[PDB]
Design an enzyme around this catalytic site. Sequence first.
Site, short mmCIF file in Angstrom:
data_model
loop_
_atom_site.label_atom_id
_atom_site.label_comp_id
_atom_site.label_asym_id
_atom_site.label_seq_id
_atom_site.Cartn_x
_atom_site.Cartn_y
_atom_site.Cartn_z
N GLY A 30 0.76 -1.26 0.00
CA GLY A 30 0.00 0.00 0.00
C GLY A 30 0.79 1.31 0.00
N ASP A 165 7.42 10.07 -8.50
CA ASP A 165 6.57 11.06 -7.84
C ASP A 165 6.95 12.54 -7.99
OD1 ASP A 165 4.75 9.07 -7.04
OD2 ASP A 165 5.28 9.11 -4.98
C1 LIG Z 1 8.99 -1.01 -5.42
C2 LIG Z 1 8.57 0.39 -5.88
C3 LIG Z 1 9.52 1.43 -5.26
C4 LIG Z 1 8.62 0.54 -7.39
N1 LIG Z 1 9.46 -0.05 -8.24
N2 LIG Z 1 9.19 0.32 -9.47
C5 LIG Z 1 8.19 1.21 -9.45
C6 LIG Z 1 7.52 1.95 -10.47
C7 LIG Z 1 6.51 2.80 -10.13
C8 LIG Z 1 6.10 2.92 -8.79
C9 LIG Z 1 5.07 3.86 -8.36
O1 LIG Z 1 5.05 4.34 -7.09
C10 LIG Z 1 4.03 5.21 -7.05
N3 LIG Z 1 3.46 5.34 -8.20
C11 LIG Z 1 4.07 4.52 -9.08
C12 LIG Z 1 3.72 4.34 -10.53
C13 LIG Z 1 3.87 5.44 -11.39
C14 LIG Z 1 3.54 5.31 -12.74
C15 LIG Z 1 3.06 4.10 -13.23
F1 LIG Z 1 2.79 4.03 -14.54
C16 LIG Z 1 2.91 2.99 -12.39
C17 LIG Z 1 3.22 3.11 -11.03
C18 LIG Z 1 6.78 2.22 -7.81
N4 LIG Z 1 7.82 1.37 -8.13
#
Ligand SMILES: CC(C)c1nnc2ccc(-c3ocnc3-c3ccc(F)cc3)cn12
Length: 351
Positions: A30, A165
């Site tokens: 989450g 972010d």
């Molecule tokens: C484990 C963790 C740190 C992680 N690793 N790769 C990632 C990649 C993304 C996100 C993420 O966190 C909050 N929003 C997103 C997001 C942003 C754009 C999207 F297209 C899909 C998800 C977290 N990620």
Amino acid sequence: ERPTFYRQELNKTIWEVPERYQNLSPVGSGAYGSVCAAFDTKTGLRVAVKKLSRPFQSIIHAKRTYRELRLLKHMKHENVIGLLDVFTPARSLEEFNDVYLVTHLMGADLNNIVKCQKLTDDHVQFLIYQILRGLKYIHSADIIHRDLKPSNLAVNEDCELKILDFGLARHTDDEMTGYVATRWYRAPEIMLNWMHYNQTVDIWSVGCIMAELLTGRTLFPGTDHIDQLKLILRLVGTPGAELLKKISSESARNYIQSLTQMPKMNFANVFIGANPLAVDLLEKMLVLDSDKRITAAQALAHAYFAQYHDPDDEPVADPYDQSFESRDLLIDEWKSLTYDEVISFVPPPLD
Ligand SMILES: CC(C)c1nnc2ccc(-c3ocnc3-c3ccc(F)cc3)cn12
């Protein structure tokens, strides 16, 4: 050409996604929002698929939806999170309700790798180099991250890093009160609303991250806003006559003036045994006056990064039209703008 979608329940939501995405599994417990790791059969990458919650709940949420999608569509740089895909199951605007965003799954954040650990000097070099390379790109689009901190840095097994972010409003409301990491990386002018701030806030955050990677320790773990500011002025000195003029908030100026003045500390005695080039870099990042901080483009050319620096491989961005920020629109208008941005999306090339 519209893919076939399939449904499943994941963390009490119905997720309806194209069949190309297999084996969806919640991640981050989450912490990142409603996000699932999946396997993308078309690109063969592990991807993170985010289902936006309550995307069109208010004028403010609608715009936040649009803003995040605008921001993600614009970014095309190795050190910045961008869009592999954006989709909705809806077949017209009238049935449009949900937005799904897809990007590379890095797998961990910097924070949940390096907790309590001094890193080797080349790991520091490489990680900061990449933060500054992504940041030069972001700033060249006139986007301000505003919330840079280890948790917003997504890192993979090979120590490759993408910035998450950036440019969001979101960080506003969650708590900045007390002994909390959400505040420890924030530049003092934004922490205490000293003035109309800008992109230099983010270089402060880079300084704080770099120090912590060197020492193993949070640089300014304040117990609150006032304790943090005392931590900060002790290191970097109290504001001099010139900065005080620039603190446009009379309230803030007047409180600062009440503090016993202190000179800048000696960074060589604070960061005992660290590369002198690292020290010199941190001195250039952690300057109380934001106007005087090193920029990301300049920091990249600093000798600390000489192993990684390549001015023909440190790109800048297309201009980013943020005129929408001053627009006064209704919910349906932000929703329709968002729809158009979904529908017009173009996949990056798969090699
Ligand atoms: C484990 C963790 C740190 C992680 N690793 N790769 C990632 C990649 C993304 C996100 C993420 O966190 C909050 N929003 C997103 C997001 C942003 C754009 C999207 F297209 C899909 C998800 C977290 N990620």
